[PDB]
Amino acid sequence: QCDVPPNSRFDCAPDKAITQEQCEARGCCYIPAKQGQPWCFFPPSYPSYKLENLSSSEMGYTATLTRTTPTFFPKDILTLRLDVMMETENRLHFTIKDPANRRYEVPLAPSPLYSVEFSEEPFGVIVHRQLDGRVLLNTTVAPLFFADQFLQLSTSLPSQYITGLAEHLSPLMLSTSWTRITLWNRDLAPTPGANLYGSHPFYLALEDGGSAHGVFLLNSNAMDVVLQPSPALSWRSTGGILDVYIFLGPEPKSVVQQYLDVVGYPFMPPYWGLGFHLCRWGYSSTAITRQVVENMTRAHFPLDVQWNDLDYMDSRRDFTFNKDGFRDFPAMVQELHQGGRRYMMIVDPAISSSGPAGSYRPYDEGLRRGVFITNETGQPLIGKVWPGSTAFPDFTNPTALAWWEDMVAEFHDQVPFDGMWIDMNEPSNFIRGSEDGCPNNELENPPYVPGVVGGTLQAATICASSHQFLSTHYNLHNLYGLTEAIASHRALVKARGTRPFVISRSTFAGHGRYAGHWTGDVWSSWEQLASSVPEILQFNLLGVPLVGADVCGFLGNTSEELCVRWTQLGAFYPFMRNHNSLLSLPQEPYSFSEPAQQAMRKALTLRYALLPHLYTLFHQAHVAGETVARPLFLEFPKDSSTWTVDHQLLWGEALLITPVLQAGKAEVTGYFPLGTWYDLQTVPIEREPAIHSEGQWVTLPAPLDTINVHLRAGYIIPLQGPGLTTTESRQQPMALAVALTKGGEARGELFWDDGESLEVLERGAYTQVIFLARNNTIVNELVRVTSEGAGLQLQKVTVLGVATAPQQVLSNGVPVSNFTYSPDTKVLDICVSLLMGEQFLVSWC
Ligand SMILES: *[C@@H]1O[C@H](CO)[C@@H](O[C@@H]2O[C@H](CO)[C@@H](O[C@@H]3O[C@H](CO)[C@@H](O)[C@H](O)[C@@H]3O)[C@H](O)[C@H]2NC(C)=O)[C@H](O)[C@H]1NC(C)=O
Ligand SMILES: *[C@@H]1O[C@H](CO[C@@H]2O[C@@H](C)[C@@H](O)[C@@H](O)[C@@H]2O)[C@@H](O[C@@H]2O[C@H](CO)[C@@H](O)[C@H](O)[C@H]2NC(C)=O)[C@H](O)[C@H]1NC(C)=O
Numbered sequence: 001q002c003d004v005p006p007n008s009r010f011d012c013a014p015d016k017a018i019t020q021e022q023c024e025a026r027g028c029c030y031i032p033a034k035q036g037q038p039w040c041f042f043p044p045s046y047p048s049y050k051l052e053n054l055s056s057s058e059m060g061y062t063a064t065l066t067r068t069t070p071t072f073f074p075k076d077i078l079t080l081r082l083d084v085m086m087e088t089e090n091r092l093h094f095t096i097k098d099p100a101n102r103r104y105e106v107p108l109a110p111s112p113l114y115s116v117e118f119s120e121e122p123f124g125v126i127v128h129r130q131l132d133g134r135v136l137l138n139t140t141v142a143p144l145f146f147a148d149q150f151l152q153l154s155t156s157l158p159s160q161y162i163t164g165l166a167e168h169l170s171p172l173m174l175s176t177s178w179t180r181i182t183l184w185n186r187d188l189a190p191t192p193g194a195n196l197y198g199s200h201p202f203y204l205a206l207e208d209g210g211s212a213h214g215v216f217l218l219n220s221n222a223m224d225v226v227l228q229p230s231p232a233l234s235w236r237s238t239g240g241i242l243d244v245y246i247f248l249g250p251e252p253k254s255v256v257q258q259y260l261d262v263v264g265y266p267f268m269p270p271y272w273g274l275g276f277h278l279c280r281w282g283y284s285s286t287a288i289t290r291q292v293v294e295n296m297t298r299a300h301f302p303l304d305v306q307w308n309d310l311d312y313m314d315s316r317r318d319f320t321f322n323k324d325g326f327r328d329f330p331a332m333v334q335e336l337h338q339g340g341r342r343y344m345m346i347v348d349p350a351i352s353s354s355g356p357a358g359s360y361r362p363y364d365e366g367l368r369r370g371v372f373i374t375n376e377t378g379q380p381l382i383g384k385v386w387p388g389s390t391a392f393p394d395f396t397n398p399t400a401l402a403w404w405e406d407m408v409a410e411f412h413d414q415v416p417f418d419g420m421w422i423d424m425n426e427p428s429n430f431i432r433g434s435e436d437g438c439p440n441n442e443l444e445n446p447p448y449v450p451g452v453v454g455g456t457l458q459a460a461t462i463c464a465s466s467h468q469f470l471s472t473h474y475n476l477h478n479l480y481g482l483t484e485a486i487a488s489h490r491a492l493v494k495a496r497g498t499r500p501f502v503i504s505r506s507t508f509a510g511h512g513r514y515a516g517h518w519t520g521d522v523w524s525s526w527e528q529l530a531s532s533v534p535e536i537l538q539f540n541l542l543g544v545p546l547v548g549a550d551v552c553g554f555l556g557n558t559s560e561e562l563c564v565r566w567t568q569l570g571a572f573y574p575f576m577r578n579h580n581s582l583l584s585l586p587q588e589p590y591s592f593s594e595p596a597q598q599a600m601r602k603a604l605t606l607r608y609a610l611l612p613h614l615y616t617l618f619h620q621a622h623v624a625g626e627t628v629a630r631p632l633f634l635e636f637p638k639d640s641s642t643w644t645v646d647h648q649l650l651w652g653e654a655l656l657i658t659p660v661l662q663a664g665k666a667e668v669t670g671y672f673p674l675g676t677w678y679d680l681q682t683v684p685i686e687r688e689p690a691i692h693s694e695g696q697w698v699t700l701p702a703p704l705d706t707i708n709v710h711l712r713a714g715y716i717i718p719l720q721g722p723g724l725t726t727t728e729s730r731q732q733p734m735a736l737a738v739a740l741t742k743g744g745e746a747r748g749e750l751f752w753d754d755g756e757s758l759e760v761l762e763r764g765a766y767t768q769v770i771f772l773a774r775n776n777t778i779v780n781e782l783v784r785v786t787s788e789g790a791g792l793q794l795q796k797v798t799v800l801g802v803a804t805a806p807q808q809v810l811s812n813g814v815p816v817s818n819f820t821y822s823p824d825t826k827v828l829d830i831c832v833s834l835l836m837g838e839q840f841l842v843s844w845c
């Protein structure tokens with residue numbers, strides 16, 4: 001009864017410090033660890049629920065679950081309903097709910113890849129992969145708890161390899177050594193072990209052999225997820241229901257895709273959103289802000305988007321501008337547009353409530369329309385943020401959405417900003433709960449407090465029992481940032497009539513359908529640089545591919561060498577912004593020594609060259625639920641060596657980036673999956689040429705002015721000529737980079753539209769082209785050709801891995817005007833005059 005192997009003990013006192021006597025009185029086993037592992041744990045006989053009246057339907061199954069013995073938590077729900085829905089061959093879905101009470105729920109050969117079976121007593125759901133018989137879910141392993149404010153469901157895991165459960169600063173692969181992962185959106189500088197800005201209750205689990213599955217728990221309550229070495233996992237939520245989805249893959253990429261079929265495919269950003277953004281707190285005037293642009297331009301540094309932080313505001317209030325430094329804010333932004341750039345600025349959620357009545361429209365209308373989160377007496381809950389006393393909009397209230405749209409649209413008529421930087425949307429509060437504290441009820445003081453920093457649900461936020469239109473804050477807290485992202489997205493669509501650009505701090509599952517994300521107040525340090533790679537990858541797995549960290553870091557002072565290395569790696573973040581704190585030394589690219597400016601300019605130049613490629617990868621995310629930046633294991637799951645790699649990334653299938661992440665290094669050791677990898681340095685953009693890998697670690701030269709980038713054999717990459725903006729670069733001629741397999745083959749693609757309109761795919765207003773290398777030929781294949789894309793000029797074709805100097809190079813049957821062959825590098829560089837949207841044939845021999 002108490003003979004349970006150590007790694008398999010499930011905690012019977014998750015709620016408090018317990019003595020042996022109390023442990024044994026709960027009906028549990030007490031065995032001290034010899035050195036965490038729980039001392040108090042459930043014997044296999046501990047009372048759970050019993051399955052009864054299991055029944056079949058066309059959709060799947062239903063059953064009643066009955067608990068006859070209470071747990072140690074209050075308000076056990078003794079009778080539950082089980083519903084199992086076999087929704088697709090790839091997707092299994094089950095819920096457990098109270099049949100007598102509607103509980104809070106988040107507002108969201110032919111055969112399945114899975115089979116399901118049930119344990120009767122104690123109750124459990126067992127899900128096998130049909131193909132190899134492997135056990136993916138087994139909830140029999142621990143008791144089911146289902147109490148008003150405490151849900152626990154556990155499972156065995158099929159391996160020690162699991163990723164997901166944002167937002168935390170951790171390796172891509174989570175530790176299963178008694179790790180407690182807390183999902184409660186919290187304003188805090190990224191650090192290991194803490195609940196951070198967002199919550200994504202989703203994991204992907206690898207299985208021996210390289211298949212994988214995913215599990216989503218659709219639950220927005222504060223929760224702990226506890227992983228143990230057996231290996232196993234327990235969800236512990238503080239409310240709601242169990243709403244579980246299992247995605248059968250079998251490939252890691254399909255798991256991600258199947259997960260996004262439920263939560264939403266990522267939104268398609270405007271092309272301009274993919275250029276360089278530059279911001280700091282401290283650009284304290286329009287004159288200083290104009291100087292940033294001027295300084296970048298004179299030093300030939302590309303810049304698509306200038307930003308402002310709090311600086312622009314009048315006394316730190318949304319939807320105003322001060323009349324000292326920012327008197328001519330409208331003219332600055334118009335000027336920006338005149339030069340072919342965009343403008344972004346910070347918006348906070350909380351609205352100043354202390355102004356004289358009649359003098360501040362956002363609050364005054366807010367009041368009239370009842371848009372704000374309210375307290376016990378029905379009055380606005382007042383906290384403290386930048387402007388002082390503030391009320392907090394309820395983005396679940398339809399009237400609040402309408403009010404948000406008005407404020408954005410009215411401010412947009414004054415200053416034509418191109419998107420919104422939504423910060424502080426945990427929501428963050430400078431004080432605990434409210435100016436008036438919080439009441440004493442079960443929501444503020446719950447029977448189980450997850451492991452949140454501050455040890456309370458109110459720390460750095462508003463009262464848990466405060467009222468919103470759809471429910472209490474207790475239930476909705478983890479959706480705050482999400483709901484604001486939805487509101488802002490809609491607001492920007494209505495105000496501007498083109499694709500919105502929303503960058504949000506706080507997020508939830510499903511966020512990437514509406515907005516992007518930056519990882520928050522990271523320190524300017526080597527460790528945070530290194531940590532940003534797993535974090536960027538994680539968000540990509542979670543369907544938020546528009547993500548990055550503050551290039552060169554946010555807090556403290558960057559160094560020149562750190563900024564060089566941060567810029568090199570950061571140019572490979574899908575969302576690329578250098579942002580800096582109030583107190584920090586300047587870190588704009590132009591503020592450094594000449595050799596460092598050169599390395600930084602080179603990294604920006606390579607990013608801009610690759611923008612057509614990066615844009616196509618976002619197209620694949622948007623229509624097929626693909627990742628943009630992806631870990632090696634997503635692309636080479638069968639090579640088990642890739643499983644723990646999180647300090648390299650891929651862009652899509654073909655581009656392997658291997659950064660230096662340490663001070664004083666002039667080399668880097670990177671893993672190279674089986675195949676040939678061409679050094680991108682061999683492609684002309686306005687040391688071994690090829691790595692021939694068996695699946696091995698390779699040491700690469702990486703002096704300060706270099707980041708290592710290789711192109712997988714078998715792939716063709718579209719590139720475009722230079723510009724300091726995408727307005728410029730989009731008008732330039734294009735080039736292909738063709739990486740031949742040894743057998744002379746390669747494939748690639750280009751998606752092209754106008755860069756910003758809505759409904760492009762639905763209206764068919766794009767061009768899609770495929771490129772094929774075969775038998776010493778390169779042709780294009782025209783999937784779709786329209787006015788947008790038809791006049792793209794192809795001026796250059798570079799072929800990697802051509803073994804012998806050719807005697808003739810033809811374009812459409814005519815000797816080209818010039819080519820080079822380099823016998824050292826195996827590169828054939830061809831000048832051409834062709835159109836992306838008209839069929840061509842380039843041959844050599
Ligand atoms: C719900 O929220 C409202 C604000 O919307 C809270 O109203 C606040 O209540 C306190 C008293 O409990 C007021 O404090 C008093 O201020 C006056 C005049 O300035 C002072 O002379 C008194 O001695 C006292 O400090 C406070 O002014 C008022 N806030 C506002 C903005 O009017 C209300 O208390 C909240 N209800 C609960 C139960 O939290
Ligand atoms: C398990 O189900 C039995 C039988 O319920 C009937 O069949 C079902 C498919 C559904 O149509 C029910 O509404 C039917 O009542 C339940 O046993 C019955 O208990 C009821 C009410 O307490 C009583 O009228 C009958 O005498 C019982 N019938 C028999 C044949 O035993 C039972 O409660 C269900 N178990 C649980 C825990 O829900």
Ligand SMILES: *[C@@H]1O[C@H](CO[C@@H]2O[C@@H](C)[C@@H](O)[C@@H](O)[C@@H]2O)[C@@H](O[C@@H]2O[C@H](CO)[C@@H](O)[C@H](O)[C@H]2NC(C)=O)[C@H](O)[C@H]1NC(C)=O
Pocket residue numbers: 556557583584585
């Ligand atoms: C980040 O740097 C500032 C300034 O550091 C000084 O000036 C630089 C150009 C560089 O040469 C440094 O080595 C200098 O020492 C720090 O802010 C300073 O704080 C100290 C007290 O701690 C104060 O006496 C200085 O005058 C401040 N300087 C100014 C002008 O703001 C700051 O502490 C650094 N941040 C961290 C976290 O280390």
Ligand SMILES: *[C@@H]1O[C@H](CO)[C@@H](O[C@@H]2O[C@H](CO)[C@@H](O)[C@H](O)[C@H]2NC(C)=O)[C@H](O)[C@H]1NC(C)=O
Pocket residue numbers: 044121122126135138140141
């Ligand atoms: C699901 O997990 C349960 C509990 O860990 C496993 O059930 C135990 O299995 C062994 C061998 O069958 C027995 O000695 C115990 O009696 C079982 N426990 C219970 C409570 O029945 C079970 O093997 C797992 N199922 C699968 C398919 O792996």
Ligand SMILES: *[C@@H]1O[C@H](CO)[C@@H](O[C@@H]2O[C@H](CO)[C@@H](O)[C@H](O)[C@H]2NC(C)=O)[C@H](O)[C@H]1NC(C)=O
Pocket residue numbers: 288289291292295588
């Ligand atoms: C933009 O660049 C200009 C030129 O480098 C900067 O202005 C100089 O700043 C230094 C401070 O280190 C002063 O000694 C000089 O008075 C300024 N020189 C000139 C040419 O006027 C300016 O600080 C930069 N602005 C921004 C916003 O980066």
Ligand SMILES: OC[C@@]1(CCC2CCCCC2)NC[C@H](O)[C@@H](O)[C@@H]1O
Pocket residue numbers: 281309310346423424505520521579580581
């Ligand atoms: O708007 C101001 C800031 C920073 C404020 C905060 C001040 C004290 C120390 C930490 C930074 N909001 C929080 C955001 O994360 C940050 O980017 C933004 O610059």
Ligand SMILES: [Cl-]
Pocket residue numbers: 018019020021
């Ligand atoms: Cl004791």
Ligand SMILES: [Cl-]
Pocket residue numbers: 103104470471472
């Ligand atoms: Cl509710």
Ligand SMILES: [Cl-]
Pocket residue numbers: 641
């Ligand atoms: Cl290895």
